[PDB]
Amino acid sequence: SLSEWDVVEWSDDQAVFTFVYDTIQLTITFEESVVGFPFLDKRYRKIVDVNFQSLLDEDQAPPSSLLVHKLIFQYVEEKESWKTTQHQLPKMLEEFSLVVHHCRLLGEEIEYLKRWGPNYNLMNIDINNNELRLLFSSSAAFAKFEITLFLSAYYPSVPLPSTIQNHVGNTSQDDIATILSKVPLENNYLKNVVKQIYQDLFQD
């Protein structure tokens, strides 16, 4: 059948496997040439290296796509810093496909917010590495604040650290932490947090 990758390639000695998801590449190096059926086997095979490569032009890409690529980059980087036991191909690949899927979704949410954000009083979006900064502002509501959300490739399944810089009104860290907690850790998390913030703090 198929998987979430467009293409799988391997070396002539079959020790190095490349998996491609558009502009994203994951390279897996086995201790020795792979024999048998790596996805069906269930055979212990020693993996000595896992590498992320990116085909992305940082100069010709929306900051959102860059964020996406940076999150997967950092995800694979931190994964490899484990150096008694290692993950095995099928598992590695399942998790990775899911991570890529969800991070691409996230990029789309960012695009939605860049376009439609003023409808929720979201007047600025800034991305710095993995930090997403959202400025909410309304003279009418008498509320202005910027929350910093620290994202990860595990998005949206994990709770987000956050920080707030308050300017006008009474909005606090606690209020924001509360809102983040109420929204279900699943698809559209970010769009749903923005909506929650709008309803609670700007409709009110």
By CB under 5 A, residue 2 contacts Cl ion: no
Q: CB of 30: closest distance to Cl ion in angstroms?
A: 14
The H or E element containing residue 185 is none
Nearer to Cl ion, 46 or 83 (CB): 46
By CB under 5 A, residue 1 contacts Cl ion: no
Q: How far apart are CA 31 and CA 52, in angstroms?
A: 18
Nearer to Cl ion, 90 or 161 (CB): 90
By CB under 5 A, residue 44 contacts Cl ion: no
Q: CB of 90: closest distance to Cl ion in angstroms?
A: 11
Furthest-apart CA atoms within the chain: distance in Å:
68
Environment class of 131 (CB within 10 Å of its CB; exposed 0-12, middle 13-18, buried 19+)? middle
Q: CB of 40: closest distance to Cl ion in angstroms?
A: 6
SS3 content of the chain, % helix, strand, coil (to 5): 35, 25, 35
Q: CB of 47: closest distance to Cl ion in angstroms?
A: 16
Q: Which residue in the shown chain puts its C-beta closest to Cl ion? A: 37
Q: CB of 41: closest distance to Cl ion in angstroms?
A: 8
The residues that bridge with 47 in the sheet, in sequence order, are 30
Nearer to Cl ion, 15 or 127 (CB): 15
Of 120-139, binders to Cl ion (CB under 5 A) are none
Count CA atoms within 13 Å of residue 70 on its CB side: 18
Going by the DSSP 8-state scheme, the letter that residue 186 receives in this structure is S
Here the tokens at position 147 are: 């929350």
- Member of 1, 2, 37, 83 binding Cl ion (CB under 5 A): 37
Residues of this chain that interact with Cl ion (CB under 5 A) are 37, 39
